[PDB]
Amino acid sequence: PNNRYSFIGGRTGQWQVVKIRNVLGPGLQLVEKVNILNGAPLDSAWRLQGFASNIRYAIRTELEALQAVQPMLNRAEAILAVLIPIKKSAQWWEMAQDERRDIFERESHHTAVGLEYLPGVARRLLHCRDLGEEFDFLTWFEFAPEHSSAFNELLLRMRASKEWEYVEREVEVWLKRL
Amino acid sequence: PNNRYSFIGGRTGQWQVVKIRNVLGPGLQLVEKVNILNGAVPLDSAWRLQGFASNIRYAIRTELEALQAVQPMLNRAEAILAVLIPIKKSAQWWEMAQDERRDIFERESHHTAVGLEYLPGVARRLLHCRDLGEEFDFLTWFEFAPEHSSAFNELLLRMRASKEWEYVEREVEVWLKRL
Ligand code: HEM
Ligand code: HEM
Ligand SMILES: [Cl-]
Ligand SMILES: [O-]
Ligand SMILES: [O-]
Structure with missing residues (x-):
């Protein structure tokens, strides 16, 4: 599949790691670079x-x-x-569709809040729970340096929301484009 | 992982193939049996x-x-x-927003309400495969006593009359008997 993307932490890639912050739950090992590949190698610490x-x-x-x-x-x-892998709890995934939509938007305003940070912040959403991965989602954000304060504020806003009572694992990987 | 299932058409397996009805679009080759495996994955096998x-x-x-x-x-x-029924929906289905698809699915089509009439005769399982890049989007599985073949068939004619089914662009029925 080419709807599939892999991110490999290690010594080669398009992107230098700048910082990794272990927000919640077990972290990811610090590495030098992340290689991004469309599809599914030594001196790599995690994929x-x-x-x-x-x-x-x-x-x-x-x-x-x-x-x-x-x-x-x-x-x-x-x-x-910024690559932010996220895992939600089992109680999230047992809920029905209306219950989840109600938390995501009605209670948390995920989309309304995020729209306040466009067009500065571009974004991509990838799914992984269904593959058996350790995380449920891989989220990707890229922006000019002017916007990093704003992006840090967005994160604090999202993490105070009802949606985030269900997040069990979260890591931030800050990157710079080589 | 544990959540993945493979269905292999061929000369071995736990289910015998009674008939294949090529309902819409290209079919599957007629085979003797279906082997069902928990896992991802075939020597005298024709399709997987x-x-x-x-x-x-x-x-x-x-x-x-x-x-x-x-x-x-x-x-x-x-x-x-x-009955194993692989289904593919059209690109126009998958571009629509969540409310639009939900409204077609239940409000216009009453998928769940119509199906609920045929429980407990019919047991079912739903599996997803579009995200894997498969040639179908869904594998649906239905099992029942012979006493309900008629009723199962009526359900099918009902569902295929629905607005939802106007987005279905490939459909096969593999009828099976347990060994
Ligand atoms: C930048 C502005 C943002 C916008 C406009 C935005 C918008 C969205 C939208 C529309 C969805 C729903 C997609 C769908 O219906 O399938 C989504 C999902 C998601 N977003 Fe955001 N988002 C933003 C920022 C963030 C941030 C900063 C994070 C993480 C720290 C994030 C994490 C997620 C996750 C994990 C999901 C999947 C939710 C689930 O399916 O349970 N988003 N976002
Ligand atoms: C027999 C009684 C049935 C019941 C109770 C039933 C119930 C359901 C429900 C509740 C869903 C949505 C699951 C979700 O929320 O993720 C669903 C989806 C689906 N069903 Fe059925 N259903 C029945 C029969 C059938 C039949 C006979 C077929 C095929 C010929 C069928 C094809 C599908 C497909 C392809 C989906 C996924 C649709 C989508 O996500 O776009 N179903 N069914
Ligand atoms: Cl795979
Ligand atoms: O997002
Ligand atoms: O179903």
């Missing part, structure tokens, strides 16, 4: 993988709003990135 | 399908609770017939 998939929660009017402002990846100015 | 069990995508809590009231376990003794 994470996920796939791009269909929309799970956003309704039409939210999609139209996102599409009006969201930027593309690979802007020349967007030389910083 | 796979999918994963996953979280709920559409049902709401009160639907889940009704379903959970009545739905039968798999591998009942009398449940000697099974």
Whole structure:
């Protein structure tokens, strides 16, 4: 599959690691670089993988709003990135669809809050629970240096939300584009 | 992992192939048997399908609770017939937003309400495979005593008349008998 992406921490890649912050639960080993590959090698400490998939929660009017402002990846100015792997608890995944949507948006305003940080912050969402991975999602953010304060504020805002009562594991990997 | 299943059409397995109906689009080659394996993966085998069990995508809590009231376990003794139905939906289905797909699925189509009429005759399992890059999007599995083949067939004619099924672009029925 080429909806599949792998991220390999180790000594080679497009991206220098700048910092890793072990927010919640067990961390990831610090390494020099992350190599990103479309598909599924020595001197590598960890590999994470996920796939791009269909929309799970956003309704039409939210999609139209996102599409009006969201930027593309690979802007020349967007030389910083942040890879944030996330795992949610088993109680999250047993809930029904309405219960989860209600937490994600009605209670937490995930989409409304995130829209306040576009178009500065470009984003990608990959899924991995269904592959058996140690994390449920691989989230990817890239932005110009001007926006790193704003991005740090977004994170504090999201982590205070009801949605985040269900996050069990979270790591931040700050990257600079080589 | 544990959540992945493979279905191999060939000369071995636990299920005998009674008929294959090539309902829509290209079919599957007729084979003698189906082997079902927990895991990902075939010498005298003609085709191999796979999918994963996953979280709920559409049902709401009160639907889940009704379903959970009545739905039968798999591998009942009398449940000697099974039907494997691989399904592919169109690209236009997958671009739509979540509310739009939910509204087609239940509000316009009453998938869950219509299906609930046929429990506990029919037991079922749903497996996902679009995200794996498979040639189908879903493997659906249904098992029942012979007493319900008629009713199962009526369900199918019903569901295929629905708005949901206007987005279905490939469908095969593999009818099976347990060995
Ligand atoms: C930058 C602005 C952001 C926007 C516009 C945004 C928007 C979205 C949207 C629309 C979804 C739903 C996709 C769907 O329906 O399938 C989503 C999912 C998700 N986002 Fe964000 N997001 C933002 C920032 C963040 C941040 C900063 C994090 C992590 C620290 C994050 C973590 C996630 C996760 C883990 C999911 C998957 C949720 C689930 O399926 O349970 N998002 N986001
Ligand atoms: C027999 C009684 C049935 C019941 C109780 C039933 C119930 C359900 C439910 C509740 C879902 C949505 C699961 C979710 O929220 O993730 C579903 C999905 C689905 N069903 Fe059924 N169903 C039945 C019959 C059938 C039949 C006969 C077929 C095929 C010919 C079928 C094909 C599918 C497909 C392909 C999906 C996934 C649809 C999607 O995600 O786009 N179902 N069913
Ligand atoms: Cl795989
Ligand atoms: O996101
Ligand atoms: O189903």
